[PDB]
Design a protein around this ligand. Structure first.
Ligand code: CL
Ligand code: CL
Ligand code: CL
Ligand code: CL
Ligand code: CL
Ligand code: CL
Ligand code: CL
Ligand code: CL
Ligand code: NA
Ligand code: NA
Lengths: 302, 302
């Protein structure tokens, strides 16, 4: 069926009934750069807001070689066996699940952060029980994913532990606990656990947990889902999950508003030039930082 | 002697010769809110920039009960015995050293960040060998101090370890390793060390060290100074210290420039109102985040 201004309400109806063709169509619309599609997309997203917010939002990162694909397939299939509908938003770095009718998989091209969030909203409005946003754990991708999900899960394989990961990890999982590397897996699991037991809790309500699994042998997956449920229980008992979700949305709005204002300034060719000359003046000991700041402020005011 | 526009150059001369009365006078001038003093202060700070930058800058935080005062006295007196001139900038939270002629102690009232930096510059121009900026370790004060010093030292006494501290600690010191609490001190020292050995290094060149001392018994202090020297050796071998200092100055300029622009916007009574109404519209599911952002952008442009 066509999606357009006249049919928007019926299209939303179809979407909320969980019709997969309409979900895919709506996502494609949201991804179009055609100015007309951008305005209709805006109408759609405004319209669906009341239908969002009753979906468990999970983030999953995996380092290269961590077995993210096999884990996601096993985990996804477990959720479907539990009778749940699961969507996977596969974000680009800066199988059996594919065949499941109760699943839905969509890639997000390398911003992509706003895009991932909007696609997640569509999945929520479509009645998915669990939405998983996943990407490679590299650079700061853990903290970026963490900011849009209820529960953040990092996959690791058996330099020290990344501090940014410690900041955001709710669960750490060591995949490929199979064959002959049990000891290597146990040592890695122990190391993450030492860090997560000694550092202050991200949430007062939750000691982060470190688990192991073998996706390809189907062991440990049930236990990971159970830990996620335990997390949900702990955070919802105090009303902290709702608070987290509100804080994430406020922080996104605030950060994007600030960043647009700042990007416009630092993009300006005249300001960029004056800024760089000011920096060089300070570096070369001709101006104090105080004076550097004042003249930047005056340039901005004028 | 008077400090004024006519005498500025001779006053700078006196300052560079290490005359303590002129240093105190210059600091008082920098702290005056009298508009005339603010302009002369600007001239002074510009003028001294070429004389700065050959001083070891240390940051020291202590938690309540960590023995910061006794440690600073013992440490300061050690440096003076080594024939060094040491200045202490005592920053407000958001003895024998006092009697030493080769020392200089100045408080900074509860911004205070810009003020601490400017007073540090005066000490550098005055020929101090070591300048120590110190404050209570509470909230985010560790990261704030860390951003203006060559080497950051945190005092702890025998909830888990603060992640912000792990981000910035170059050395951790457990004071009051005396009397009957050796075991309690050893356990605390071990805990910090576990975290600092397992987490990725802040600097590739340096594994953070955790030491113990008894300031009041004068034991362990020599070893702490030696560790600081080891830090300086490690970072200067690769040219990393110079890079750190440059990055700190650029980051301060950048952050203060951004924060002034943003504070003016979010201070604006009309924008604050529209921003809060937009936030509430999103919270109440009447607008998508996309639309929230767009209309904030339009409000700003207009
Ligand atoms: Cl079309
Ligand atoms: Cl804790
Ligand atoms: Cl909740
Ligand atoms: Cl300039
Ligand atoms: Cl006067
Ligand atoms: Cl490392
Ligand atoms: Cl260096
Ligand atoms: Cl509004
Ligand atoms: Na949210
Ligand atoms: Na600097």
């Amino acid at each position: 069926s066509l999606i357009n201004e006249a049919t928007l309400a019926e299209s939303i109806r179809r979407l909320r009934q969980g019709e997969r063709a309409t979900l895919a169509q709506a996502m494609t619309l949201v991804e179009s750069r055609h100015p007309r599609h951008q305005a209709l997309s805006t109408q759609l997203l405004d319209a669906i807001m009341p239908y969002c917010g009753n979906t468990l939002r999970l983030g999953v990162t995996g380092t290269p070689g961590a077995g993210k694909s096999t884990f996601l397939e096993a985990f996804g299939m477990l959720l479907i066996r539990e009778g749940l509908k699961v969507a996977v938003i596969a974000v680009d770095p800066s199988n059996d699940l594919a065949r499941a009718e109760a699943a839905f998989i969509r890639p997000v091209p390398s911003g992509a952060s706003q895009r991932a969030r909007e696609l997640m909203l569509l999945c929520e409005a479509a009645g998915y029980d669990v939405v998983i946003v996943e990407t490679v754990g590299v650079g700061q991708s853990e903290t970026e994913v963490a900011r849009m999900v209820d529960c953040f899960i990092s996959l690791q394989i058996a330099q020290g532990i990344k501090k940014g990961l410690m900041e955001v990890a709710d669960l750490i999982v060591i995949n490929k606990d199979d064959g002959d590397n049990h000891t290597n897996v146990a040592i890695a699991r122990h190391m993450y656990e030492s860090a997560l037991h000694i550092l202050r809790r991200k949430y007062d309500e939750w000691q982060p947990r470190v688990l192991t699994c073998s996706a390809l042998e189907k062991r440990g997956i049930d236990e990971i889902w159970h830990a996620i449920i335990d997390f949900k229980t702990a955070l919802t008992a105090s009303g902290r999950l709702q608070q987290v979700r509100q804080q994430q949305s406020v922080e996104w709005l605030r950060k994007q508003t600030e960043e647009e204002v700042l990007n416009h300034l630092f993009a300006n060719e005249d300001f960029d030039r004056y800024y760089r000359q000011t920096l060089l003046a300070v570096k070369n000991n001709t101006l104090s930082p105080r004076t550097g700041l004042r003249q930047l402020s005056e340039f901005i005011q004028t």
